[PDB]
Amino acid sequence: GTHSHGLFKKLGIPGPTPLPFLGNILSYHKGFCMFDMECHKKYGKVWGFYDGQQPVLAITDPDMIKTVLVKECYSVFTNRRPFGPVGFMKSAISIAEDEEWKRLRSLLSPTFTSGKLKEMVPIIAQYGDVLVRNLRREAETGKPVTLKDVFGAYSMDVITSTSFGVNIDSLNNPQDPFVENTKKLLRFDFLDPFFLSITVFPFLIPILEVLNICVFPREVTNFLRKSVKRMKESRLEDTRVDFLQLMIDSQNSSHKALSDLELVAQSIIFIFAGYETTSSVLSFIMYELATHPDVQQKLQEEIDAVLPNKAPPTYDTVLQMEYLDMVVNETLRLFPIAMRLERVCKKDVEINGMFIPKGVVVMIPSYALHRDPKYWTEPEKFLPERFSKKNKDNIDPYIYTPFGSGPRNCIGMRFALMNMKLALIRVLQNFSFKPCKETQIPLKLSLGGLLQPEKPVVLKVESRD
Template identity: 65%
Template sequence: FGTQKHNIFKKQGIPGPKPLPILGTLLNYYKGVWKFDVECHKKFGKIWGLFDGPIPLFTITDPGMIKNDLGPVGIMSKSISISKDEEWKRLRALLSPTFTSGKLKEMFPIIEQYGDILVKYLRREGEKGKPLNMKEVFGAYSMDVITSTAFGVNIDSLNNPKDPFVAKARKLIKISFFDPLFVSSRLFPFLIPIYEMLNVSMFPKDSVAFFKKFVGRMKENSLDTNQKHRVNFLQLMMSTQSNSKDKESHKALSDMEIVAQAIIFIFAGYESTSSILAFALHSLATHPDIQKKLQEEINLALPNKAPPNYEKLIEMEYLDMVLNEILRLYPIGFRIERVCKQDVEIDGVLIPKGSVVVIPVYALHHDPQYWPEPEEFHPERFCKENKGNIDPYVYMPFGNGPRNCIGMRFALMSMKLALTKVLQNFSFLPCKETQIPLKLSQKIMLQPDKPIVLKVVPRDATMNGA
């Protein structure tokens, strides 16, 4: 029992770690999924087989295969899905207009105000001389950006960490991938429709109910034509309902779909933005020459601490290089997974219906074949001269192909704005609490082993002391 599929890889000569009955290879994730993927890549090469419980995972790192699988005209683009294919196309078409450059420019001043709050907070706390936990600081910034741009709510969670809205949002992002519900659905996929029927979810019921109620209130307010509404993603999603001429509304987002997208926005946006910013500042603090070079570019682009704008952020080449290198070193989306809806053959490998194709992004980003000295922080990898030589199927911090991350430009904008604001005003230095070199946790999510703690010094002080 629980081993009937275990010969699926042997038949095709595909190597992989030996699976256990029922559990498959899941127990190996306790060492960290990213670490397990790197080990397998070194041991088994460009393709290997895993089992999440009974589900076969075809794991591939060959760029040619990945392109054939995930590219716009690849085999998997027609045979894979996270949501059902037509449903996904519909959702993507409805959500894409909310992430246009025009909409992002409208939201820029909203995000900038939280960059200013961040600077004031760092100045106040930095003056006390105590080192600061970067995840806590940038977690608050990320939460403020998400709540304001997604929900139109002004909170300032740096100074109001106990706000009820923040408390409910934080509960959503504390779910564990070792939650019995998550584990049981991986081990026994037949339970998923039963859980759905019983309305059982990994997300806390009180938080979900809170956001359902909030969406309902916002919908009522949106009907008030006399009331001015600040642009936010929730408002833009609700506009698909009022703009849709189709009364059956299959071309509009339902209330539950809006709630689901809002929750995903919190879950994905908070973790990725706050973690990447914390990793970035650790790398800059431990590489002062790179930090100085980036500050010089910011000074040149924005003299006398001029406020940044959308166009200036896009123009800063070294900022782009630094952020790209951080996303290579620490891809928060360290795996891409796609479910195969039908039997397909890819480069001579038969992938049966119900199997999963896995792209181990972290392992690819740390492969010395593509990245010399892969553990080193070298932003020059992404300079103009080198960027054209990078295979897009070995660098995928936001995925690739038709199903890449829809919020990519928004995430980059909020990260670039935060880095520009803080580096205009401060230098970040290691202190005795700073872990050097940085080690990653063995948890499921890509996190540092110890909190990233740094000393924050106003640039006026560093310049005066020079």
């Protein structure tokens, strides 16, 4: 019948012996991260395992990784692992493949330049202020703050705004249908029963498509696909520096420009990529700043220096802040929320020594590499100075990859970084953050399939009066 599980040893690559049907998925009770590091402790440079009958080949040599992500990104390693029933979200850039992906990447790239980003800063800066007013109250309240709630609220405020021009306080408007629906767009947990099932029975994905059962909830994609050219139509033609307009502007004068539907797919996929990723990283950073008041006041002092008497951050004053950037990247080292980068091997190739067969998912265990002893001194420590100017080129760009690498890295990187930084500055420009003993110390990751804390982060918030 199926004859998948013989592949790696038959070519000479080590790995945990698979079970019939299951492959190695029982080994996921630990979680992706724990599983990945333990594999690297025991098989070294390269190993192989099976998500069901699907061969996954892990790699950890930096120029082999450069090779996959950059080298023949186009010729061989262009797409990611198909993962569940996707419906029309087939057209979203992150999900699209080969030429359609290359088309969308090119069509969507100009929208993410540093230029258009400088023009989005005032919009998103505004919701820094909104966050502060919303944080004042729960600080002064007395009681601890659940960070993913006040950052979830910020991330959304900033998403609706730069995506559709929609200007709302998500926190204080929880039924605004436009807020209500978009919270359901959380990140996928590939260790969920559903997805695990899908992994074992991939021959059930086409079954779900028929039934229109979809990993993006029907009701949520229905409401935004509706909102979009409710608004792409003449609320627009009254005549917005945002994502939607830039995509509209590129339907209006190379290869065939953005479809109407393909545009909505993008709008949606942007939300999905940017909402819970941003809010998560922000929680992780605020956790670190709380449990290292060493870093927190040093940063607060950098912020006041660049921005005296609560001066409002600009594009340039942000890029200026070197210790802030140090804080941001060190937290992404410890908590790379993608965990893994993956590419599907389109053809038989041999990359710096070893032959990869067509069909193998080539995987880069980012979480593991970020906590590797060979490239990192004291990997478990929160130590921003590893990213100090100098001391930071020892650092291989192919070992440290919180946003991936090559032509298919995170399109939203400069934005995500800018967005997070504008939050941090205004929040630190007004408050301090300290442990309560509801605060889990030390902090544990979920054993699940999302990089997120065991229990949500709660902290004491004080005004700098």
